[PDB]
Structures are given as C-alpha cells and as structure tokens.
C-alpha cells in the first residue's frame, strides 16, 4: 500500500489523529525487518513519497509540521533517520534524506518564526550529524580553520573542527609545524567544544615537535581554563620534564605561572640523577640576567636534598646534634652565586619587612 | 555569619512555599526539618533558635499530615479508628506547644502569641 | 485496607439497622462529611465505596418518613444486603 | 563453657610456633560473637594486646585484622588505659613497618579513644617522615581520627595545607593526602578554611588526577557541612561549562548527581538554568545523557515548583526546549531521560500553556515504545522499564490521559 | 593459594573455622607467602582514592591489549611516550584484570635498564609488579628471575628454592637502577624463606638423626649470611665510580628486616667480618 503513502502523508501532515500511529507502526515494522535483514523494502518508498510531497508544497507542509503538529513530525523524522543509520547498505537513501532535510531547513528558516526550531532544532541536529563527511585536504583545512577563527563564526568553526577530526582519524600525513600553533592558540582563546579532541588528534599522529609546540603554547598563551589540559599533555607526551629543549623548559620552570608547583614537583620526583645534577649546575651557574626565579630555584634546591628516596631507610627524627650526616658539595663560584641570589631575592621586601 | 544567614534563608523559603500541593508541602517541611536539626547539631551558639524553629515546623507538619488523613474521605458513621492518626496528632502538637513555650529561655510576646 | 473495608461494611449494616429501625430521632446524625473522593486504590474498593454511598443516601432520606413499624424499612435493608453481596 | 573456651585459645597463644599463634589470634571474632559477655570481651582484648606488643610482626597483622573486624564489640571494654598502653608501646620501635601497623591499629580505635592527645601527637609526628609504608598508614589513622574528634582536625587541616604547599612529598602521596579534608565538617570555621584552601589548590595543581580527587572530596565536604552548598554548586557548574577534560566533566556530573539526590530544594533557579544551557551547548552524547539524568532527578523533587515559581512564559523557559528536543533525540537513553522530565513536569506543575506539552509527551511515549519494542538488549529493556514507569506515573497522576495511553499500549501489544 | 586466602580473609563471617585452619597451614608450610610487607600493601588506605580514580578513568580505555602493549614496547626506545600512556592506564586496573599482562611486562624487562628511560616508567612498572605480587607471587618470581638473567637457562621454582643466590646472578646494570633493585630484594627475601621451608620438608621426607637436623640449621645460617654478604658487596662502590645512595638505602632496609627477624645472623655476619669501608654506612643505615 506504498502508493497511498504520499496521500496519507498529506492527510497525516494536515490532520491524522489516528493514521499517524498506523504510519509509525508500519515504519517500525520495516525498521525491525531491516534489523533482522528480512528484505524490508518499504522505507525507501516512504522516503520517496515524503520527498515528492515536500517538493509539491514545501511551505504548507513545513508550516503545518513546525506550527501545528510537532510531535508527529518529530517522531516520523526520528524513525526515518534511525532507519538510514541502521541501513548502512550503500546509503542509497542518504542523498535523498540530505536533500529533503536541506529543503525543509530552507523552507523553515523563513516559515518558522514563532515556533523557533521546535522541531527544526531536531532537523538541524540530524543534518549536522549526517553531514560528517571526510575531508581530503588535511593541510589546507588548518588554514581554513585559522581564517574562520579571525572571522569568528561559531557554526563554521564547529563544522571545520568536526571535518578536521575525521581527517586526523584518517590515514596520517605530514602535518605542518607553523600554522598548528596559531590554530591551537585561536581554538583555545575561542570556546572550542571539540578542543580536547582536536588536540589529541593533532598530537597523536603529528609530524613535528610535540613537546616544543606544547611548551611554546603554554609559555606564551595566558589561557586560564585549558591550562590544566595543556599541563597534562606536556607531562604525558614528554615523560621527562626537560627532554628536548632545555632552554625553553628552564624558562618555563623558572622566570623573572599559576601551575608552576605541579611541574616543579614532577621535575623533582621524575628526573634522572644526571639531569638533576646538570640542572643544579646550570641553574646556580653565574648569570647576570637573573633568568631564574630565586624563590622557585631555592625551594627546588632545598627539596632536592630531602627527596625521601635518599633517606628512605635510615633512622629518623632522632639525630645526634654534632653528627652532620649528609650535605651537597658545591664549588666556589657556585656558592658565591647562590649567596648572591638568595640575598638579591631577600632584597625584594615589597611588603614583608625587615623582620 | 553564614550559618545564621542560611537559617534565615531556609526559614523564609519554607514561609514562601505555601501555594502548592500538600504532598509537596510535607516533603518540603521534612527536608527543612532535618536540615535545621543538622544545623543545630553542627553549631552550638545557634542550638537554641535552630531547635526552636525545628519544633515549630514539626508542629506544622504534624497538623498538615493529620489534616490530609484518609478519615475525611469516609462518612461520619463509618469512622472506625485505627486510621485516625489525628487523635494522637492533637496530643503531640499540644505537648510540643507546651515544650516550646516553657523549656526555651528567651521568648517574646510575639512568639508567645504565635504559640498560643 | 481490605479488612478495614469489611469492617466498614459490617458497621454500616449495624448503623443502618440502628438508625432506621431503632430510635431514629435519637441518632439524628447527618452524614455531613467529605464523601466519594476518588482516592481508592482498587476497583473493588471503589465499588464498595459506591455501595456505601448508595445505602447512606437512601437511609438519610428514609429516616423519618414512616413509623418504626418498618413498613418499607425492610425493603431498604434487603436492598442493602443484596448490594453488599453483589460485589463478590 | 564461656570461661573454658577462652583458656583453650590461651594455651594456643602460648604455643611456640607462629603457626598455632596465628591460628589462635584469628579465631577470636568467632568467640566474641558467640559470647558477647563484657567480662570475656575485656579478658580477650587484654591477651590480644599483649601478644601484639610482643609479636613476630605478623601476629601484629593478624591482630590488626581482628580489630578491624570486631569493631562493634570495642566500646564494651572496661579497661582502656592498660590496653592502649600495650598497643601504643610499639610506636617507638625503630622498625618502619612496626610503626605502620600500630598507626593502623590506633586508627581503628578512634571510637574508644577519640581524645587521646598522645595518640594525636604521635600520628601528627609520623605523618611527616621518609618511610612510605608508614606515611601511607599515618594518613589512614589521621583520616580516621579526623571524624571522631575536633581538636585533632583543627591541627591537621593546617598541617595538611602546609605539607601540600611545600614541594615535598611525591604526587602519588599528595593524592592520598587530600581526601582527609572530607572530615572538616566539625565546625563552620573548619569548613570555611578548607574551602579557602580548595580555591587555591585546584588552580595550583590543574592536573586531572588531582582535580578528580579534590572536587569529589570537597563536594562530599559541602554535603556534610550544609552551609555553603549554593557556593559548591556554582563552582561545579563553572567547571562543567568550561574545563574541556571529558573526565572532569563526567566527575562534575557524577557529583552534581549526589548533590541533587541529597538536597534538592536548595537548588536555585539560575542554577538549573545554567545547567540546562550547558546541556544544550555540549555536542557530546554521553555528557548530554549525564546532564539529562541529573535534570530528571531534580524534576521529581520540589525543585521544579521553585523553577516554575513566578516572582517569562514556561514556553520561554529553556528547560522546556531541552526536554522537547531530547524527547526525540536519536539515542534511546537520552530519549528516555527526556520523557522523564516531561512526565514529571506535566504531572507536578499545571500551568495554562503547558497543556500542549501533555500531547507532546503522550505522543513521544509511543515513539519510545516502538523504538524499544524489538531491540532486546539490556539497555533497551532498562529504557523500556523507565518509559513504562513514566507512563504509569502520568496516568495515575492525571486520569485525563489514561484512555489515551491505554489504547496506544494495546496497539503496541 | 594467595588469591584464595585473601578472599577468605575478606570474608570471615561465613567460613567458621576454615579461615583459621587455612591460615595456619599457609603460615606453617608456605612461609614465603606470609611476608608482612606483602599483606600490608594490600590494605592500602581507606582513602578510596584508587576506587574513585578507577570508577571515573577506566571508561572505555580504547581497548588496550597485551599485544598492543607488546607492539609499542618492541619499539619503546623509538617511542617512549606511547609506553608511558599505556602503563598509565594499566595502573588503574584491579588486581585481577592485570594478570593477562604478566608476561608482557615481566618477560621484556631487559631493555628497561637501558639508559635514557625516565624513571617514571620504572616506578610505574615497580608499582604494577607489586600489585601482581599481591596476587600471584609463585609464577611471578620465576618469570622475573628468568627475565632478569644476564645477557640463558630457564630457572624453575624448585630450582630457585634450592639455591636462591641465583637471584643475585643478574645483569650488573641492575645494581645501579633503584626501582628494579627493590624487586630483586623482594624476590631474595621471599626465596630465602622458601628455601628454609623446602629443606625442612625435604629432610622429613627423606628420613625414611640429629646430625641431619643441625646440618640443615648450619646450612641455613650460612645461606642467610652469604646472602647478606653479597648484598654488602653490592653496596661497595665499584672502581668506575672511583643512585648508589638509593641502592644502599634499600639494602639497608632489607638488612634491617633480616636482623630483626633473627639475631644469630647479626652474630655470624660479624664473626665473618666484612669490608670495613662499609662500617660508616651500615652503622647509621641499619
């Protein structure tokens, strides 16, 4: 009885009262048959009938659906869309569904004002979900997203991010190491709902220096909320705190931020002894630029000796006063620099006072 | 004084929420009563006022629960007790009025007239 | 609730016989209370409550019409019994 | 036989081998729950304490278990100072594992010695050492006392603040350390100090591990100390909106669920509004499911009446739009948790404009029914159960729609 | 046996005397399982930190598999962050779900010793190894020993219980990597007790008189003493030095536990005497 589908659809579109239930049951029967693989060739006929009806009078049907009968329209649309999702066999009806959705959205954008996307919201959600095409560039998409970011279009940015994510999930390619920083800074500054997914994708199969990019972004951008995500990435993708770019790493740890102590504790309890010794020597080394924050540096020095791994077993909190057990040998000029730096930061006295 | 401010907030919320079904009223009063008891235990300087208002709200809840009894939905001659909880509700509420009037130390004429 | 309902039926027959056959003026009590509110939890209870209301509305009307000689009072009692037994 | 059964274990405890000694030590809870007589309980614990004080460092573990098993019987001990002396006399032993066992045992005795200053001091001392296997036990004992005493918690909270903000102690132990701040509910000043500590700790350690631990601990704190719940909820909502970590968002949901389950009425209107806005913004189905579960839980309780309290049409209210869209969203779970809120609002709040929402709901119900008709998956039947429960609630609350729903259900039969 | 006895410890109300009898039999015949450092680590905390962390971080961990970890691990030097990420999600798993990964970790512990790996990998592997120790020690010890033999027989459990010093015949690079020295000492302390039990059972078996018993006792005394002696030899610096501070501290803890366990070892190690360059260390360490 597929022939009467178009006629009942118009009767259903205007007023059905009961025929809507029969139509839904028929469609559910076809969906169940398809799930069982029982050659249920009825959905396509309903889809074609719906497309023909929409082409006949898009405005009248759109108005009736989005103003009078929202429930029935939403139910039918949901049933149809799940049918397409289940029937991944060649997605023949996919093009028809996309065209019908586009036409309905075009009609509704003008016909529906008081009923602001009561069901057009579901229609738009279905369109967005279905439009997850696979990008084929993966190199100019980054530039497109960067251009959009200056344009500041929310929907465009969301679509571009969604497309790029499928591109990254696709076969890996040679990612550029120049525009990636700009894209990440802009996606961070703007509210990027898919920022975490984009970062994970771009960092997993990346043809460039992930630690360098992350360090530069963290050091430069004063991004508040995502800073935690950046810190976790920095730690995990760089198992050693100071691995690739010691200059930038030390600039980050010590300076003339907000999350500094976490990184610093990780450095204290996750650094090879040679790396730590070299860090001590370079940090306490003579430097007239005051390139190391003396407070952080001195706290780190004081923590190094008391790292519990070193006293892990000797008798505790019962020491002989004269007996000095352990110290840290240092050099002449290094000692001079140490004393000079401690005195220099002591001379801050912004508010603390002489006492 | 966040504690005292919160106490006033809860009391005024209960005051305000009276235009709604008795079913919801019972639950609101129960939530706020256990709230007030918890706050009274937590603090010590508010232990008086907290418990005083708690007993008051409990009195009101008992009255409402008595009024919403199934007894009123059956004819007069069919009264058969074993369900008319209002019988004990009256004694409990009166005893609570006595308790609140006398046990607590600082009481004003306004509060006394409320209780009476 | 079922047991309470059976007790209510028994007490109903007692009240009917006492207020209709015995001194009716002594009883002189009006069924002035909320009645018939659809709060019952089972069709059985609903049907019993309907029967009770029918019996009360008959007996209140028939309180003073005749003398205690029980001219038609027997009819009211019999109809109440039949109704009470009707719901199985 | 009650006295005889004791000496039969006594001779075993007197046996030479740790085999029989261990067998005896782990045999007591049986005798206790067999004979709860206080005299016998006290006699038993005296010998347990002695064998603990002079033990092979495994009899001590067995006795620690006995204490952790028979806790209800502890209060009925007539002689406490002797017992506690025996147990505490092995905290000065130089063995870093014998200190850890004893700190655990003390932690297991907070119920009967909650004010002992010497025990408090010894725990606060062992809390800052170099032996991991004893620091990880001092943490436990400290968390145990911080619940059954106050003057101990006041000192601890300061100790912990300092000892977190010192760059010492590895992150692994810093994780174990934070939860102690649950039991700061003794006083309003304690709660305020702990909250002030949080506001800095979260920003100072924006990891994922630390955030996951801290937010849950202090939502528990806000639940316990019912004076700052309005403040806690808005912080949770801000982190729900902003932080991109999927894990942090999921914790936010699983925490707001607890707060909405304990104290629903306190939820203001703008709180629900912001939660609904966040639920709208997200593109992620799992997070949307989470927010909708929270909203369904709120809807049943009194919060809905406050939300629709006047001194903006209900149609203008965003909650309605979210409910309607999720009522038809593809996912079965989201659809179910949507229809829940719709049914709850329709049954509870009765405004003039909402009547169309009655039709909307009733018609969505058959869509859910047909969707779940033939799935035959555990989640499918869970959603179906929820849907039918919503149907029953709607019908009973409103007899008007009973005839409508019944005929549909029959047609799906 | 270890798994079941832990389960029984957990459930005590039901099993009336079975728990007591089982624990006696364990402690009497299998002393290399009743080592307090093993059972104490089970109690962890009551902080629920692990539980809450797991409940919210396991989710769907992109279906990590032993073969997946093996793939990443075969090229770990080329990519270390991949290994870090995999084991980081491994740590959260419960004591049971980890068993399928026993071979992957233990079998391939050689190249971990290679210079360059940040010690976080080693610390996490040590933690995982302890978790697995709390579940299945018997198999695990043999796997670890045969994986840490120098670069190759396949020692058996019965073999090691005869001559436990086989534990110390390991890659000399082990003596300068703290996290793995810990595991080696754990195995050594376990297998010395195991050897005691094995000899005690063997003599009773073969009895089908005192001379044999005090021969057993003398052998055990000398065996413990020799273990201590090689351990001190480890503490001695090698000429190349002319990390070691952490290694000496761990050996100090182990020696302390042995000394408390038995005095005669203290009286014997000293009557043998040991290189006196070590006195300034031990006198304070122990």
Coordinates of N, CA, C and O in Angstrom, one line a residue, chain A residues 70-205:
Chain A
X70 N 4.0 19.2 15.8 CA 5.4 19.0 16.0 C 5.7 17.5 16.5 O 6.7 17.0 16.0
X71 N 4.8 16.9 17.3 CA 5.1 15.6 17.8 C 5.2 14.6 16.7 O 6.2 13.8 16.7
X72 N 4.2 14.5 15.9 CA 4.1 13.5 14.8 C 5.3 13.7 13.9 O 6.0 12.7 13.5
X73 N 5.6 14.9 13.5 CA 6.7 15.2 12.6 C 8.0 14.8 13.2 O 8.8 14.1 12.5
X74 N 8.3 15.1 14.5 CA 9.5 14.7 15.1 C 9.6 13.2 15.2 O 10.7 12.6 14.9
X75 N 8.5 12.5 15.5 CA 8.6 11.1 15.6 C 8.9 10.4 14.3 O 9.7 9.6 14.2
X76 N 8.2 10.9 13.2 CA 8.5 10.4 11.9 C 9.9 10.6 11.5 O 10.6 9.7 10.9
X77 N 10.4 11.8 11.7 CA 11.8 12.1 11.3 C 12.8 11.3 12.1 O 13.8 10.8 11.5
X78 N 12.6 11.1 13.4 CA 13.5 10.2 14.1 C 13.4 8.8 13.6 O 14.5 8.2 13.5
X79 N 12.2 8.3 13.3 CA 12.1 6.9 12.8 C 12.9 6.8 11.5 O 13.6 5.8 11.3
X80 N 12.7 7.8 10.6 CA 13.4 7.7 9.3 C 14.9 7.8 9.5 O 15.6 6.9 9.0
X81 N 15.4 8.8 10.3 CA 16.9 8.9 10.5 C 17.4 7.6 11.1 O 18.5 7.1 10.6
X82 N 16.9 7.1 12.1 CA 17.4 5.8 12.6 C 17.4 4.7 11.5 O 18.3 3.8 11.5
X83 N 16.4 4.7 10.7 CA 16.4 3.8 9.6 C 17.6 3.9 8.7 O 18.2 2.9 8.3
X84 N 17.9 5.1 8.3 CA 19.1 5.4 7.5 C 20.4 4.9 8.2 O 21.3 4.3 7.7
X85 N 20.5 5.3 9.5 CA 21.6 4.9 10.3 C 21.8 3.4 10.3 O 22.9 2.9 10.1
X86 N 20.7 2.7 10.6 CA 20.8 1.2 10.6 C 21.2 0.7 9.2 O 22.0 -0.2 9.1
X87 N 20.5 1.2 8.2 CA 20.8 0.7 6.8 C 22.0 1.3 6.2 O 21.9 2.2 5.3
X88 N 23.2 0.8 6.6 CA 24.4 1.3 6.0 C 24.7 0.7 4.7 O 25.9 0.8 4.2
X89 N 23.8 0.0 4.1 CA 24.0 -0.7 2.8 C 23.9 0.3 1.7 O 22.9 0.6 1.1
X90 N 25.1 0.8 1.3 CA 25.2 1.7 0.2 C 24.7 3.1 0.4 O 24.8 4.0 -0.5
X91 N 24.0 3.3 1.5 CA 23.4 4.6 1.8 C 22.7 5.3 0.6 O 22.9 6.5 0.4
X92 N 22.0 4.5 -0.1 CA 21.3 5.0 -1.3 C 20.3 6.1 -0.9 O 20.3 7.1 -1.6
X93 N 19.6 5.9 0.2 CA 18.6 6.9 0.6 C 19.3 8.0 1.3 O 18.6 9.0 1.7
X94 N 20.6 8.0 1.6 CA 21.3 9.0 2.3 C 21.2 10.4 1.5 O 21.0 11.4 2.1
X95 N 21.5 10.3 0.2 CA 21.4 11.5 -0.6 C 20.0 12.1 -0.6 O 19.8 13.3 -0.5
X96 N 19.0 11.3 -0.7 CA 17.6 11.8 -0.7 C 17.3 12.4 0.6 O 16.6 13.5 0.7
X97 N 17.7 11.8 1.7 CA 17.4 12.3 3.0 C 18.1 13.6 3.2 O 17.6 14.6 3.8
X98 N 19.4 13.7 2.8 CA 20.1 15.0 2.9 C 19.4 16.1 2.1 O 19.3 17.2 2.6
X99 N 19.0 15.8 0.9 CA 18.3 16.8 0.1 C 17.0 17.2 0.7 O 16.7 18.4 0.8
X100 N 16.2 16.3 1.2 CA 15.0 16.6 1.8 C 15.2 17.4 3.1 O 14.5 18.4 3.3
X101 N 16.2 17.1 3.9 CA 16.5 17.9 5.1 C 16.9 19.3 4.7 O 16.5 20.3 5.3
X102 N 17.7 19.4 3.7 CA 18.2 20.8 3.3 C 17.0 21.6 2.8 O 16.9 22.8 3.2
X103 N 16.1 21.0 2.0 CA 14.9 21.7 1.5 C 14.0 22.1 2.7 O 13.5 23.3 2.7
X104 N 13.8 21.2 3.6 CA 12.9 21.5 4.7 C 13.5 22.6 5.6 O 12.8 23.5 6.0
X105 N 14.9 22.6 5.8 CA 15.5 23.6 6.6 C 15.4 25.0 5.8 O 15.2 26.0 6.5
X106 N 15.6 25.0 4.5 CA 15.4 26.2 3.8 C 14.0 26.8 3.9 O 13.9 28.0 4.1
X107 N 13.0 25.9 3.8 CA 11.7 26.4 3.9 C 11.4 26.9 5.4 O 10.8 28.0 5.5
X108 N 11.9 26.2 6.4 CA 11.6 26.6 7.7 C 12.3 27.8 8.2 O 11.8 28.6 8.9
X109 N 13.6 28.1 7.7 CA 14.3 29.3 8.1 C 13.5 30.5 7.8 O 13.7 31.5 8.5
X110 N 12.5 30.5 6.9 CA 11.6 31.6 6.6 C 10.2 31.4 7.2 O 9.7 32.4 7.7
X111 N 9.7 30.2 7.1 CA 8.3 30.0 7.6 C 8.2 29.9 9.1 O 7.1 30.3 9.6
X112 N 9.2 29.5 9.8 CA 9.1 29.3 11.3 C 9.7 30.4 12.0 O 11.0 30.5 12.1
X113 N 8.9 31.3 12.6 CA 9.5 32.4 13.4 C 9.0 32.3 14.9 O 9.8 32.2 15.8
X114 N 7.7 32.2 15.1 CA 7.2 32.0 16.5 C 7.6 30.6 17.0 O 8.1 30.5 18.2
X115 N 7.5 29.6 16.2 CA 7.9 28.2 16.6 C 9.4 28.1 16.2 O 9.8 27.5 15.2
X116 N 10.2 28.7 17.1 CA 11.7 28.8 16.8 C 12.3 27.4 17.0 O 12.7 27.0 18.1
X117 N 12.4 26.7 15.9 CA 13.1 25.4 15.8 C 12.5 24.4 16.9 O 13.3 23.6 17.5
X118 N 11.2 24.4 17.1 CA 10.6 23.4 18.0 C 10.9 22.0 17.5 O 11.3 21.2 18.3
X119 N 10.8 21.8 16.2 CA 11.3 20.5 15.6 C 12.4 20.8 14.6 O 13.1 19.9 14.2
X120 N 12.5 22.0 14.1 CA 13.6 22.4 13.2 C 14.9 22.2 14.0 O 15.9 22.1 13.3
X121 N 14.9 22.3 15.3 CA 16.1 22.0 16.0 C 16.5 20.6 15.8 O 17.7 20.3 15.6
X122 N 15.6 19.7 15.9 CA 15.9 18.3 15.7 C 16.3 18.1 14.2 O 17.3 17.3 13.9
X123 N 15.7 18.8 13.3 CA 16.1 18.7 11.9 C 17.5 19.1 11.7 O 18.3 18.5 11.0
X124 N 17.9 20.3 12.3 CA 19.2 20.8 12.2 C 20.2 19.8 12.8 O 21.3 19.6 12.3
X125 N 19.9 19.3 14.0 CA 20.8 18.3 14.6 C 21.0 17.1 13.7 O 22.1 16.6 13.6
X126 N 19.9 16.6 13.1 CA 20.1 15.5 12.2 C 20.9 15.8 11.0 O 21.8 15.1 10.6
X127 N 20.7 17.0 10.4 CA 21.6 17.5 9.3 C 23.0 17.5 9.7 O 23.9 17.1 8.9
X128 N 23.3 18.1 10.8 CA 24.7 18.2 11.3 C 25.3 16.9 11.5 O 26.5 16.6 11.1
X129 N 24.6 16.0 12.1 CA 25.1 14.6 12.4 C 25.4 13.9 11.1 O 26.4 13.3 10.9
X130 N 24.5 14.0 10.1 CA 24.6 13.3 8.8 C 25.7 13.9 7.9 O 26.2 13.2 7.1
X131 N 26.0 15.2 8.1 CA 26.9 15.9 7.2 C 28.4 15.7 7.6 O 29.3 16.4 7.2
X132 N 28.7 14.6 8.4 CA 30.1 14.3 8.8 C 30.8 13.7 7.7 O 31.1 12.5 7.7
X133 N 31.1 14.5 6.7 CA 31.9 14.0 5.5 C 33.3 13.9 5.9 O 33.7 14.5 6.9
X134 N 34.1 13.3 5.1 CA 35.6 13.1 5.3 C 36.4 14.1 4.5 O 36.3 14.0 3.2
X135 N 37.1 15.0 5.1 CA 37.9 15.9 4.4 C 39.0 15.2 3.7 O 39.5 14.2 4.1
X136 N 39.5 15.8 2.6 CA 40.5 15.2 1.7 C 41.8 16.0 1.7 O 42.7 15.7 0.9
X137 N 41.8 17.2 2.4 CA 43.0 18.1 2.3 C 43.9 17.8 3.5 O 45.1 17.4 3.2
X138 N 43.5 18.0 4.7 CA 44.2 17.7 5.9 C 45.5 18.7 6.0 O 46.2 18.5 7.0
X139 N 45.6 19.6 5.1 CA 46.7 20.5 5.1 C 46.2 22.0 4.9 O 46.7 22.9 5.5
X140 N 45.2 22.2 4.0 CA 44.6 23.5 3.9 C 43.4 23.6 4.8 O 42.9 24.7 5.0
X141 N 42.9 22.5 5.4 CA 41.8 22.6 6.3 C 42.3 23.4 7.5 O 41.5 24.2 8.1
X142 N 43.5 23.3 7.9 CA 44.0 24.1 9.1 C 44.0 25.6 8.7 O 43.6 26.4 9.5
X143 N 44.4 25.9 7.5 CA 44.3 27.3 7.1 C 42.9 27.8 7.0 O 42.6 29.0 7.4
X144 N 42.0 27.0 6.6 CA 40.6 27.4 6.6 C 40.1 27.6 8.0 O 39.4 28.6 8.2
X145 N 40.4 26.8 8.9 CA 40.0 27.0 10.3 C 40.6 28.2 10.9 O 40.0 28.9 11.6
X146 N 41.9 28.5 10.6 CA 42.5 29.7 11.0 C 41.8 30.9 10.5 O 41.6 31.9 11.2
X147 N 41.5 30.9 9.2 CA 40.8 32.1 8.6 C 39.4 32.2 9.3 O 39.0 33.3 9.6
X148 N 38.7 31.1 9.5 CA 37.4 31.2 10.2 C 37.6 31.8 11.6 O 36.8 32.6 12.0
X149 N 38.6 31.4 12.3 CA 38.8 31.9 13.7 C 38.9 33.5 13.6 O 38.2 34.1 14.4
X150 N 39.7 34.1 12.7 CA 39.6 35.6 12.6 C 38.2 36.0 12.2 O 37.7 37.0 12.7
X151 N 37.5 35.2 11.4 CA 36.1 35.5 11.1 C 35.1 35.3 12.3 O 34.2 36.1 12.4
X152 N 35.4 34.4 13.2 CA 34.7 34.2 14.4 C 33.2 33.8 14.0 O 32.3 34.6 14.3
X153 N 33.1 32.7 13.4 CA 31.8 32.1 13.1 C 31.7 30.8 13.8 O 32.4 29.9 13.6
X154 N 30.7 30.7 14.7 CA 30.6 29.5 15.6 C 30.3 28.2 14.8 O 31.0 27.2 15.0
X155 N 29.3 28.3 14.0 CA 28.9 27.1 13.2 C 30.0 26.7 12.2 O 30.3 25.5 12.1
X156 N 30.6 27.7 11.6 CA 31.7 27.4 10.7 C 32.8 26.7 11.4 O 33.4 25.7 10.9
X157 N 33.2 27.2 12.6 CA 34.3 26.7 13.4 C 33.9 25.2 13.8 O 34.8 24.3 13.7
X158 N 32.7 25.0 14.2 CA 32.3 23.7 14.7 C 32.4 22.7 13.5 O 32.9 21.6 13.6
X159 N 31.9 23.1 12.3 CA 31.9 22.2 11.2 C 33.4 21.9 10.8 O 33.7 20.8 10.4
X160 N 34.2 22.9 10.7 CA 35.6 22.8 10.4 C 36.3 21.8 11.3 O 37.1 21.0 10.9
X161 N 36.1 22.0 12.6 CA 36.7 21.1 13.6 C 36.2 19.7 13.4 O 37.0 18.8 13.5
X162 N 34.9 19.5 13.2 CA 34.4 18.2 13.0 C 35.1 17.5 11.8 O 35.5 16.4 11.8
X163 N 35.2 18.3 10.7 CA 35.8 17.7 9.5 C 37.2 17.4 9.7 O 37.7 16.3 9.4
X164 N 38.0 18.3 10.4 CA 39.4 18.0 10.6 C 39.6 16.8 11.5 O 40.5 16.0 11.2
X165 N 38.8 16.6 12.5 CA 38.9 15.5 13.3 C 38.8 14.2 12.5 O 39.6 13.3 12.7
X166 N 37.8 14.1 11.6 CA 37.8 12.9 10.7 C 39.0 12.8 9.9 O 39.5 11.7 9.7
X167 N 39.6 13.9 9.4 CA 40.8 13.9 8.7 C 41.9 13.3 9.5 O 42.7 12.4 9.0
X168 N 42.1 13.8 10.7 CA 43.1 13.2 11.6 C 42.9 11.7 11.9 O 43.9 11.0 11.9
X169 N 41.7 11.3 12.2 CA 41.4 9.9 12.4 C 41.7 9.1 11.2 O 41.9 7.9 11.3
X170 N 41.7 9.7 10.0 CA 42.0 9.0 8.7 C 43.5 8.8 8.7 O 44.2 9.0 9.7
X171 N 44.0 8.3 7.6 CA 45.4 8.0 7.5 C 46.3 9.2 7.8 O 46.0 10.3 7.4
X172 N 47.4 9.0 8.6 CA 48.3 10.0 9.0 C 49.0 10.6 7.8 O 49.3 9.9 6.8
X173 N 49.3 11.9 7.9 CA 50.0 12.6 6.8 C 51.0 13.6 7.5 O 51.2 13.5 8.7
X174 N 51.7 14.4 6.7 CA 52.7 15.3 7.1 C 52.0 16.6 7.6 O 51.7 17.5 6.8
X175 N 51.9 16.8 8.9 CA 51.3 18.0 9.4 C 52.3 19.1 9.5 O 53.4 18.9 9.8
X176 N 51.8 20.3 9.2 CA 52.7 21.5 9.2 C 53.0 21.9 10.7 O 52.2 21.6 11.6
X177 N 54.1 22.5 10.9 CA 54.6 22.9 12.2 C 54.6 24.4 12.4 O 55.2 24.9 13.3
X178 N 53.9 25.1 11.5 CA 53.8 26.6 11.5 C 52.5 27.1 11.9 O 52.3 27.8 12.9
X179 N 51.4 26.7 11.2 CA 50.1 27.1 11.5 C 49.4 26.3 12.6 O 48.3 26.8 13.1
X180 N 50.0 25.2 13.0 CA 49.4 24.5 14.1 C 49.3 25.3 15.4 O 48.3 25.3 16.1
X181 N 50.4 26.0 15.7 CA 50.4 26.9 16.9 C 49.3 27.9 16.8 O 48.6 28.2 17.8
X182 N 49.2 28.6 15.7 CA 48.2 29.6 15.6 C 46.8 29.0 15.7 O 45.9 29.6 16.4
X183 N 46.5 27.9 15.1 CA 45.2 27.2 15.2 C 44.9 26.8 16.7 O 43.9 27.2 17.2
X184 N 45.9 26.2 17.3 CA 45.7 25.9 18.7 C 45.5 27.1 19.6 O 44.6 27.1 20.4
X185 N 46.3 28.2 19.4 CA 46.0 29.4 20.2 C 44.6 30.0 20.0 O 43.9 30.3 20.9
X186 N 44.2 30.1 18.7 CA 42.9 30.6 18.4 C 41.8 29.6 18.9 O 40.8 30.1 19.5
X187 N 41.9 28.3 18.7 CA 40.9 27.4 19.3 C 40.8 27.5 20.8 O 39.7 27.3 21.4
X188 N 41.9 27.7 21.5 CA 41.9 27.9 22.9 C 41.3 29.2 23.3 O 40.4 29.2 24.2
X189 N 41.6 30.3 22.7 CA 41.0 31.6 23.0 C 39.5 31.5 22.8 O 38.8 31.9 23.7
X190 N 39.1 31.1 21.7 CA 37.7 30.9 21.5 C 37.2 29.7 22.2 O 38.0 28.8 22.5
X191 N 35.9 29.6 22.5 CA 35.4 28.4 23.2 C 35.3 27.3 22.2 O 34.3 27.2 21.4
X192 N 36.2 26.3 22.3 CA 36.2 25.2 21.3 C 35.6 24.0 22.0 O 36.3 23.3 22.9
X193 N 34.4 23.6 21.7 CA 33.8 22.5 22.3 C 34.5 21.2 22.0 O 34.5 20.3 22.8
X194 N 35.2 21.1 20.9 CA 35.9 20.0 20.4 C 37.4 20.2 20.6 O 38.2 19.5 19.9
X195 N 37.8 21.1 21.4 CA 39.2 21.5 21.6 C 40.1 20.3 22.0 O 41.1 20.0 21.5
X196 N 39.6 19.5 23.0 CA 40.3 18.4 23.5 C 40.5 17.3 22.4 O 41.6 16.8 22.2
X197 N 39.4 17.0 21.7 CA 39.6 16.0 20.6 C 40.5 16.5 19.6 O 41.3 15.7 19.1
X198 N 40.4 17.8 19.2 CA 41.3 18.3 18.1 C 42.8 18.2 18.6 O 43.7 17.8 17.8
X199 N 43.1 18.6 19.8 CA 44.4 18.5 20.4 C 44.9 17.1 20.4 O 46.1 16.8 20.0
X200 N 44.1 16.1 20.8 CA 44.5 14.7 20.9 C 44.8 14.2 19.5 O 45.9 13.6 19.3
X201 N 44.0 14.5 18.5 CA 44.2 14.1 17.2 C 45.5 14.7 16.6 O 46.4 13.9 16.1
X202 N 45.6 16.0 16.7 CA 46.8 16.7 16.1 C 48.1 16.3 16.8 O 49.2 16.3 16.2
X203 N 48.0 15.8 18.1 CA 49.2 15.4 18.8 C 49.6 14.0 18.7 O 50.8 13.6 18.8
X204 N 48.6 13.1 18.4 CA 48.9 11.7 18.3 C 49.8 11.4 17.0 O 51.0 11.1 17.1
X205 N 49.2 11.5 15.8 CA 49.9 11.3 14.6 C 50.5 12.7 14.0 O 50.0 13.2 13.0

